[PDB]
């Protein structure tokens, strides 16, 4: 799917918070909040060079 | 509050009735997977928002 990995509003915390600069899931109150997103090294992200039809 | 609307008292009453444990004969059903009511709510631990 062309949406896989992208159906989130993740945003990078930026430097200074002692974490890598990968974009992170917003909000709180669930396991998903503050996790990595989008990048191909992330669980639940988008794969590298998604295959095309 | 004691001062309540009928609509609010009706919403609260339904939340009261959902807040019970599952019947124990549900366990013996043929294809059952449910072990407990995973939607239990505690008036102090989590709030209804209304």
């Amino acid at each position: 799917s062309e949406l896989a990995g992208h159906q989130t509003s993740a945003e990078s915390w930026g430097t200074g918070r002692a974490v890598a600069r990968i974009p992170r899931v917003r909000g709180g109150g669930t396991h998903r909040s503050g996790q990595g997103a989008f990048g191909n090294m992330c669980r639940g992200g988008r794969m590298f060079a998604p295959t095309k039809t | 509050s004691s001062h309540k609307t009928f609509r609010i008292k009706r919403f609260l009453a339904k939340k009261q009735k959902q807040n019970r444990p599952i019947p124990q004969w549900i366990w013996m059903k043929t294809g059952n997977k449910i072990r407990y009511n995973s939607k239990r709510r505690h008036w102090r631990r989590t709030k209804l928002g209304l």
Partner: peptide, 27 residues
């Protein structure tokens, strides 16, 4: 004849916080 299970949910915490309790400034 099973009546042992129990459980209770609660909010999942989140640790998105920043201390920042100092400044030099020492230009």
């Amino acid at each position: 004849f099973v009546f042992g299970p129990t459980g209770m949910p609660g909010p999942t915490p989140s640790g998105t916080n920043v201390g920042s309790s100092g400044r030099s400034p020492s230009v």
